[PDB]
Design a binder for this molecule. Structure first.
Ligand SMILES: *[C@@H]1O[C@H](CO[C@@H]2O[C@@H](C)[C@@H](O)[C@@H](O)[C@@H]2O)[C@@H](O[C@@H]2O[C@H](CO)[C@@H](O[C@@H]3O[C@H](CO[C@H]4O[C@H](CO)[C@@H](O)[C@H](O)[C@@H]4O)[C@@H](O)[C@H](O)[C@@H]3O)[C@H](O)[C@H]2NC(C)=O)[C@H](O)[C@H]1NC(C)=O
Ligand SMILES: *[C@@H]1O[C@H](CO[C@@H]2O[C@@H](C)[C@@H](O)[C@@H](O)[C@@H]2O)[C@@H](O[C@@H]2O[C@H](CO)[C@@H](O)[C@H](O)[C@H]2NC(C)=O)[C@H](O)[C@H]1NC(C)=O
Ligand SMILES: *[C@@H]1O[C@H](CO[C@@H]2O[C@@H](C)[C@@H](O)[C@@H](O)[C@@H]2O)[C@@H](O[C@@H]2O[C@H](CO)[C@@H](O)[C@H](O)[C@H]2NC(C)=O)[C@H](O)[C@H]1NC(C)=O
Ligand SMILES: *[C@@H]1O[C@H](CO)[C@@H](O[C@@H]2O[C@H](CO)[C@@H](O)[C@H](O)[C@H]2NC(C)=O)[C@H](O)[C@H]1NC(C)=O
Ligand code: NAG
Ligand code: NAG
Ligand code: MAN
Ligand code: MAN
Ligand code: MAN
Ligand code: MAN
Ligand code: CA
Ligand code: CA
Ligand code: CA
Ligand code: CA
Ligand code: CA
Ligand code: CA
Ligand code: CA
Ligand code: CA
Ligand code: CA
Ligand code: CA
Ligand code: CA
Ligand code: CA
Ligand code: CA
Ligand code: CA
Ligand code: CA
Ligand code: CA
Ligand code: CA
Ligand code: CA
Ligand code: CA
Ligand code: CA
Lengths: 420, 413
């Protein structure tokens, strides 16, 4: 009766001699019969030599998986009535490295990810047992610690990693990242395996449109021809796709009239004339544009284009009699006798509305006397005794200071009570 | 032969555990060295092993799955025996919480999915008689849920889950019951009340009673006259629900000169003289904001419509007065001067009627809008005057009316 305890590395060569029962147990000298055995396909003893040998190669991972202890039993009988209990352990060697399901994974991370957020990653697997199994994961974060790593265990004592966002992300600062996750096992020959993580930084609508300048001032000549270009506004959004697709439109509080007068093309941003711009109607107008991106929760942006009109001499002067005497002027009417009161006007402004008026001949004896703003008195010029005329067809002329100028005329008749 | 017994805990005092004599095949028993002198003893002359007191497996072996007591007795003629008896667990304990009520402070702003710690329970019993799981009683339409998670040992702990959003303004407090259940065929349970105070987050804007108002006031109204008392309400708590009034960013300065709004009441009152002729009606754009963080503004608009009073007498102005001396035989109707009358008021208050002092020989003849010609009335002779002090009178149609006069002198040559 004798126990024997062996222990042998895995991946032994087929036909490797494990032991010598006869010599190790101190039996005689002969016959070595096998009573029973855990694995007949793996271990056998030569009947006439007492040598215990491997029948095939032995992969401890295929036999005992992760078990810390891995044993094979064998019960032999020796020459002439002596029994031996052989038990041999198969030791683990670090002949396997941790392995990932791929060499590269790809993920979709929005730049809106809050710092601290954590993201799944594929775990690695080491079939080796004990100290030769999975030890930990480690990251190679190239972007000065933008990404971190969290390592957590599960019930069986195996670990899995997860990505951490240690500081915020910004697509518009870096669109893509690539960082390498490695898995390390224990054992004196440390086995490792790596995987590249290729992360797409998704766009979040975090940029407002921006007009080249908040305010503009544009001069246009009044009565400008339809379709005249007013201005091409340009707004830019640094986001992607629709988040960075600008749409222009008239603000809510631009008056209807202005909407009648101008047309803005929604995609170009071109403001062009749509109606006749009368200076006498309105000196200058305000066009309040707004631009918005076509993303969700869109960000509006306001701009202000002041159109300042230029007055052109497009109104001739008008003449209007407030009161006129009749046809009965006395021969001896003193110089300065009032004959009529008149107004002259010009809707234009500046030189275009600057008037100068005169009588057709005064050769007839009448003077025009300007008393008030746009108010003239036509009176008698001379005594009506030497150059006496039976009837007069007085005609007033008004002339503005335009380029070119404009003039209008208007007549009335008067008689003298001359020969009686 | 050793003797191996196994007996439930909390046995009756003096319960017979075993019979040494029969089990070990011996003869009729002194105790040499036993594990527990107070728990088990053997009757000297019968060989019977009995309990001396109760056995609480929890007090002896705590959570240990196996719980054993040794005992060494002998019998006549050097008959040595090894007795060993295991104590089985029974579910004589329920899970227990450190209290019967917890209270929590959860803000209504808590994101759905958020989870909150809760106190765990403890069962002293062993194995299947220990803590099994927790269960919640959420009475308010499944407002809150429960997550149960294991620890390194295999012990479980609960935490509250917010499965959908909360709203203080809809329900200020909640109370829900968390119970812990153990295994064992008599299933033991123990409960704890969670009293959760729902904190306010500034999630309500102020609200004016109406977006727009229209108020009439008489021009030149006396200082301090009340224009309107605005009222805005915020349904939030504390500063989050504290209304503050102010004039909007885009109301012209002049209006700011004309009106005063009290920041806390919301009372808009007159601060300057309201001249109708300056501006017929004005717009006062008020805003109310709560005193919480990221405050929510709200806009209201009060249009002040003025009423015109006859506060402008009529003004007279000579456009032309010719010379200071007319012709002796000037025909009736000779123009002597052109004059204009005006009144800054509107309506009847600005409706004028004018006349000359006499008919002296001068008429007033209105030719155009607010334009009159003073002419000679009749033929100039048979009179004791050389120069005339002509005086014009204008009279408006106010209540009461107003009148102004203005004179000029002319001579006869
Ligand atoms: C909005 O963005 C446009 C385009 O973006 C530019 O692209 C190039 C130039 C880059 O280098 C950047 O600098 C810019 O962002 C800016 O440029 C306008 O482009 C339009 C589109 O082509 C131009 O319109 C052209 O006008 C030509 C006629 O030129 C006239 O002006 C000269 C100067 O005196 C004058 O001598 C001539 O006789 C004409 O009167 C015409 O031949 C062509 O077909 C086309 O119509 C436009 O001219 C450019 N800007 C301006 C102000 O003219 C814009 O700068 C930007 N908007 C604004 C308001 O700045
Ligand atoms: C803003 O509120 C004031 C006063 O508030 C009132 O408070 C209570 C006394 C009760 O009357 C509540 O209904 C009110 O909110 C208003 O001033 C009063 O208005 C009521 C009209 O129902 C009138 O009978 C009173 O004479 C007013 N003055 C008082 C009570 O001193 C005011 O009208 C409110 N503003 C607006 C725009 O509605
Ligand atoms: C021209 O006459 C007016 C009016 O004076 C008199 O008014 C009545 C009493 C009547 O008797 C008329 O015949 C008179 O002409 C003078 O203007 C006002 O005169 C009063 C004194 O009577 C004086 O208190 C006022 O201040 C004067 N002005 C006004 C606006 O009332 C005026 O002075 C006379 N002379 C000239 C050059 O105009
Ligand atoms: C308008 O005319 C009336 C009279 O025609 C003037 O009335 C007088 O006003 C004084 C005060 O200035 C009173 O003391 C008198 O009793 C009034 N007299 C009469 C007869 O009513 C009044 O002054 C004129 N208005 C202006 C601005 O001159
Ligand atoms: C008066 O003169 C104007 C301008 O020459 C002329 O048009 C008009 O016919 C004349 N009047 C008469 C009655 O001929
Ligand atoms: C005035 O207008 C008339 C229009 O018939 C024109 O013939 C004349 O040349 C003009 N005169 C001046 C000075 O502009
Ligand atoms: C892990 O580390 C080893 C070095 O021990 C490398 O050989 C391997 O490629 C992996 O990077
Ligand atoms: C980690 O490193 C290995 C080198 O052994 C690569 O093959 C792998 O793609 C990852 O970069
Ligand atoms: C836990 O469950 C028991 C029944 O198993 C109840 O009786 C007890 O009140 C508690 O709710
Ligand atoms: C659970 O039951 C206990 C009583 O045992 C209470 O503390 C609680 O109110 C809940 O009903
Ligand atoms: Ca192997
Ligand atoms: Ca390994
Ligand atoms: Ca191995
Ligand atoms: Ca960004
Ligand atoms: Ca972005
Ligand atoms: Ca954008
Ligand atoms: Ca453009
Ligand atoms: Ca015009
Ligand atoms: Ca013009
Ligand atoms: Ca003109
Ligand atoms: Ca007990
Ligand atoms: Ca229990
Ligand atoms: Ca128990
Ligand atoms: Ca709320
Ligand atoms: Ca709230
Ligand atoms: Ca109020
Ligand atoms: Ca609020
Ligand atoms: Ca006034
Ligand atoms: Ca008035
Ligand atoms: Ca008046």
């Amino acid at each position: 009766l004798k126990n024997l305890n062996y222990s042998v590395p895995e991946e032994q060569g087929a036909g490797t001699v494990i032991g010598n029962i006869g010599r190790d147990a101190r039996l005689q000298p002969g016959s070595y019969r096998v009573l029973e055995n855990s694995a007949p396909h793996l271990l056998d003893v030569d009947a006439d030599s007492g040598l215990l040998y491997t029948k095939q190669r032995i992969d401890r991972e295929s036999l005992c998986r992760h078990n810390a202890k891995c044993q094979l039993s064998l019960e032999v009988f020796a020459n002439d009535k002596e029994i031996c209990m052989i038990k041999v352990e198969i030791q683990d060697i670090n002949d396997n490295a941790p392995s990932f399901s791929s060499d590269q994974i790809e993920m979709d991370i929005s730049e809106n990810a809050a710092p601290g957020t954590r993201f799944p990653l594929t775990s690695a697997h080491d079939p080796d047992a004990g100290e030769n199994g999975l030890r930990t994961y480690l990251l190679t974060r190239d972007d000065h610690g933008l990404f971190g790593l969290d390592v957590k265990s599960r019930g069986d004592g195996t670990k899995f990693p997860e990505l951490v966002i240690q500081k915020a992300l910004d697509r518009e600062q870096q669109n893509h990242h690539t960082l390498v996750l490695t898995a390390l096992d224990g054992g004196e020959p440390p086995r490792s395996a790596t995987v590249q993580i290729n992360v797409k930084v998704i766009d979040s609508n975090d940029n407002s449109p921006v007009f080249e300048a908040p305010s503009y001032l544009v001069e246009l000549p009044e009565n400008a021809p339809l379709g005249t270009v007013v201005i091409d506004l340009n707004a830019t959004d640094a986001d992607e796709g629709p988040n960075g697709e600008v749409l222009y439109s008239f603000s809510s509080y631009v008056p209807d009239r202005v909407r009648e007068l101008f047309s803005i093309d929604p995609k170009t941003g071109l403001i062009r004339v749509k109606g006749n711009l009368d200076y006498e109607e309105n000196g200058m107008l305000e066009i309040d544009v707004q631009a918005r991106d076509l993303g969700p929760n869109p960000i509006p942006a306001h701009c202000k284009v002041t159109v300042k009109l230029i007055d052109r001499n497009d109104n001739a002067p008008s003449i209007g009699f407030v009161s006129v005497r009749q046809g009965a002027l006395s021969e001896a009417a003193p110089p300065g006798t009032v004959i009529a009161l008149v107004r002259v006007t010009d809707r234009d402004s500046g030189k275009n509305g600057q008037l100068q008026c005169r009588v057709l001949g005064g050769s007839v004896p009448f003077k025009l006397e300007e008393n008030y703003d746009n108010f003239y008195t036509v009176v008698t010029d001379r005594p009506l005794d030497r150059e006496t005329q039976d009837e007069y067809n007085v005609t007033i002329v008004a002339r503005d200071g335009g380029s070119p100028p404009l003039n209008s005329t208007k007549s009335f008749a008067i008689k003298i009570l001359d020969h009686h």
